[PDB]
Amino acid sequence: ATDSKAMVLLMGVRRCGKSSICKVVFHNMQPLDTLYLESTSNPSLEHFSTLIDLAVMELPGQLNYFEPSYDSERLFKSVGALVYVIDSQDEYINAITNLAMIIEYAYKVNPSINIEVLIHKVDGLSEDFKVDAQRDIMQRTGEELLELGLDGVQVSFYLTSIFDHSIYEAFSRIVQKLIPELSFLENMLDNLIQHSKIEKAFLFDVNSKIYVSTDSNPVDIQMYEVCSEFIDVTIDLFDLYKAPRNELQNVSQLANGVIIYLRQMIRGLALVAIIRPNGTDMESCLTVADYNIDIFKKGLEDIW
Amino acid sequence: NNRKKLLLMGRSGSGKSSMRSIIFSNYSAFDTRRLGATIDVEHSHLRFLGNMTLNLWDCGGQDVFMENYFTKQKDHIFQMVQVLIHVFDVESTEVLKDIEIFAKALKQLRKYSPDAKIFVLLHKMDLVQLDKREELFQIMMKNLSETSSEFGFPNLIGFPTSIWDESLYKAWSQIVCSLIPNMSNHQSNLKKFKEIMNALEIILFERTTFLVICSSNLLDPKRFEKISNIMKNFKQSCTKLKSGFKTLILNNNIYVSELSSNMVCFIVLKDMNIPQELVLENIKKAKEFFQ
Numbered sequence: 001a002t003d004s005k006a007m008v009l010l011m012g013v014r015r016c017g018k019s020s021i022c023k024v025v026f027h028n029m030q031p032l033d034t035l036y037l038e039s040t041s042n043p044s045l046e047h048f049s050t051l052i053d054l055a056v057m058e059l060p061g062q063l064n065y066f067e068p069s070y071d072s073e074r075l076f077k078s079v080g081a082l083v084y085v086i087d088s089q090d091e092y093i094n095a096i097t098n099l100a101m102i103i104e105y106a107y108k109v110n111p112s113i114n115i116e117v118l119i120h121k122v123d124g125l126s127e128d129f130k131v132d133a134q135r136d137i138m139q140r141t142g143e144e145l146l147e148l149g150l151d152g153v154q155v156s157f158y159l160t161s162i163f164d165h166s167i168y169e170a171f172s173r174i175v176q177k178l179i180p181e182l183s184f185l186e187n188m189l190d191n192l193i194q195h196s197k198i199e200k201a202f203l204f205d206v207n208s209k210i211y212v213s214t215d216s217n218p219v220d221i222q223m224y225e226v227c228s229e230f231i232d233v234t235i236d237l238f239d240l241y242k243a244p245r246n247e248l249q250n251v252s253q254l255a256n257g258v259i260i261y262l263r264q265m266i267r268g269l270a271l272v273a274i275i276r277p278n279g280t281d282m283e284s285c286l287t288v289a290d291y292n293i294d295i296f297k298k299g300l301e302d303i304w
Numbered sequence: 305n306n307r308k309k310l311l312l313m314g315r316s317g318s319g320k321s322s323m324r325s326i327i328f329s330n331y332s333a334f335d336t337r338r339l340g341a342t343i344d345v346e347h348s349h350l351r352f353l354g355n356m357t358l359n360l361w362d363c364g365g366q367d368v369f370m371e372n373y374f375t376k377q378k379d380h381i382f383q384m385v386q387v388l389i390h391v392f393d394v395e396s397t398e399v400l401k402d403i404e405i406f407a408k409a410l411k412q413l414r415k416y417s418p419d420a421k422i423f424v425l426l427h428k429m430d431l432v433q434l435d436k437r438e439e440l441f442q443i444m445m446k447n448l449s450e451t452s453s454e455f456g457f458p459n460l461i462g463f464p465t466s467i468w469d470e471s472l473y474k475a476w477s478q479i480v481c482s483l484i485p486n487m488s489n490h491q492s493n494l495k496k497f498k499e500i501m502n503a504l505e506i507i508l509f510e511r512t513t514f515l516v517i518c519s520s521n522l523l524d525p526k527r528f529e530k531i532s533n534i535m536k537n538f539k540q541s542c543t544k545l546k547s548g549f550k551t552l553i554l555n556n557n558i559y560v561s562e563l564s565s566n567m568v569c570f571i572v573l574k575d576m577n578i579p580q581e582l583v584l585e586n587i588k589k590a591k592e593f594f595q
């Protein structure tokens with residue numbers, strides 16, 4: 001059994017990747033299950049075993065000859081989020097179909113349900129391809145559900161690949177959307193970047209690609225890809241030569257001036273931010289971040 | 305001469321187009337799937353380090369195309385050839401034929417460009433199991449060496465490669481470091497840079513490809529390529545920001561800066577807090593000599 005806080009459901013046709021996905025996610029969620037459960041344990045709602053638990057469901061080619069029995073429904077309710085895996089290797093029209101079904105049916109029984117859809121196995125595909133692929137899929141459901149009479153259902157679509165970093169960036173948002181109890185940290189970040197020359201901030205555990213938290217800033221610029229890799233640079237470059245700022249830190253600046261800043265926060269937990277200075281030089285732009293950061297750092301040190 | 309012509313030959317699927325694509329076109333490993341078989345000879349050039357330019361000849365290896373390079377256009381192909389990077393797919397079944405074709409190429413070279421440098425790559429080594437990866441290379445290089453020897457070119461260089469690790473950069477670094485004439489002055493200038501920085505060591509990379517040009521010093525022997533690889537992986541995550549890499553400082557110990565529109569330097573500093581300012585200054589005088 002599993003006394004977890006959330007109950008995600010992974011459904012899709014056989015070989016969509018629903019089991020491979022569980023393996024990659026369950027692993028990277030450890031640093032968090034750890035972090036939010038005791039590193040810092042507060043919401044009385046937290047003394048649980050692990051944050052989430054991915055229960056997968058196999059989906060038959062076509063759901064005509066069959067529809068969900070009751071036991072499935074009783075599960076839908078227990079489930080907090082619903083992740084639909086569309087294998088992009090093949091055609092996906094009848095799949096977009098079975099999705100409208102799984103939605104309408106699930107939604108009657110447990111609205112307020114998160115419906116997340118993964119346009120999977122997108123590794124090795126041209127960009128204008130992923131563009132059309134999605135834009136086309138996104139539309140084909142905004143019509144399939146207007147036909148089913150429910151255009152008000154909020155559906156978030158993602159572009160993923162388990163040989164990529166995508167599935168981690170998707171699930172990062174996915175986990176956040178699920179558990180609100182872990183948003184106090186998102187909030188502390190909206191403060192760090194609040195009134196800033198700082199655009200985005202992530203809280204990455206050195207051994208997980210599922211960020212632990214980041215700002216509520218809407219214009220997520222998918223700056224995730226960039227910061228997520230920055231960690232690896234820092235770790236990897238450091239690991240080769242190794243034989244209020246006493247820890248690990250890395251700064252990088254591009255042509256146009258943007259800055260990728262990483263500063264360790266608490267034993268393996270680092271902060272990666274994007275800093276944009278319109279002319280203002282680096283040396284001091286960097287010092288003014290340190291202020292808001294060193295503050296934020298104390299904040300985590302206080303609750304730990 | 306000021307221009308270099310390299311022959312990238314091998315049979316179809318050897319993975320030689322993925323190479324070029326990763327090394328001079330900013331492709332990601334898995335990004336090569338979409339490449340599709342190259343038809344005939346696909347040309348690419350690249351001004352490398354200012355004074356030297358490069359002309360890459362990716363020769364689609366479908367048997368038919370291959371037969372035509374050796375017959376009709378052999379003079380076109382094997383004419384004025386600086387280097388031959390022949391590639392063998394480690395997962396081939398037609399190994400013996402794979403090698404014959406190689407001789408075929410040597411024949412046309414032993415004749416039209418005899419002083420060309422020979423380089424062989426056992427590509428896709430990521431498919432072989434670790435315990436085997438070495439003896440197979442040893443075995444293959446052994447045979448290839450003798451064949452190479454009989455067509456003029458005695459001692460050739462070998463490199464086990466895969467688009468999935470850094471072993472690809474080491475090979476292409478050494479290959480390109482063969483067409484660079486002026487290396488005496490670079491190390492000499494580098495060595496001095498070292499001392500004025502009193503660094504553990506300094507490395508030089510080509511801004512564009514991030515291949516190693518030279519250095520000046522226990523430590524990882526493959527460290528050079530692992531640096532190339534990692535920075536190139538950073539390069540690619542920084543796509544969306546659509547800005548090129550300028551600088552990076554890691555723990556007040558490792559400084560990586562661009563020197564000119566051609567060379568980037570990597571300095572591991574030996575200290576932890578030399579006035580960051582006075583260290584950067586030393587960086588700015590360095591540009592004078594590495595443009």
Ligand SMILES: Nc1nc2c(ncn2[C@@H]2O[C@H](COP(=O)(O)OP(=O)(O)OP(=O)(O)O)[C@@H](O)[C@H]2O)c(=O)[nH]1
Pocket residue numbers: 314315316317318319320321322323336337338339340341342343363364365366427428429430431465466467468
């Ligand atoms: N496992 C593994 N696969 C590779 C490697 N390099 C390339 N590939 C794969 O092999 C394929 C071979 O494609 P190419 O590189 O375009 O073919 P080519 O060798 O250039 O030959 P062309 O058809 O003849 O002209 C691509 O589909 C890649 O996914 C490698 O290092 N390891």
Ligand SMILES: Nc1nc2c(ncn2[C@@H]2O[C@H](COP(=O)(O)OP(=O)(O)O)[C@@H](O)[C@H]2O)c(=O)[nH]1
Pocket residue numbers: 012013014015016017018019020021120121122123160161162163
């Ligand atoms: N190229 C690619 N292959 C994938 C991806 N996800 C899963 N696979 C492969 O798809 C196959 C089926 O995955 P699996 O987890 O067994 O599917 P399941 O039956 O739905 O659990 C395996 O060979 C996986 O390695 C992906 O994102 N990209």
Ligand SMILES: [Mg+2]
Pocket residue numbers: 320321322340341342364
């Ligand atoms: Mg090719």
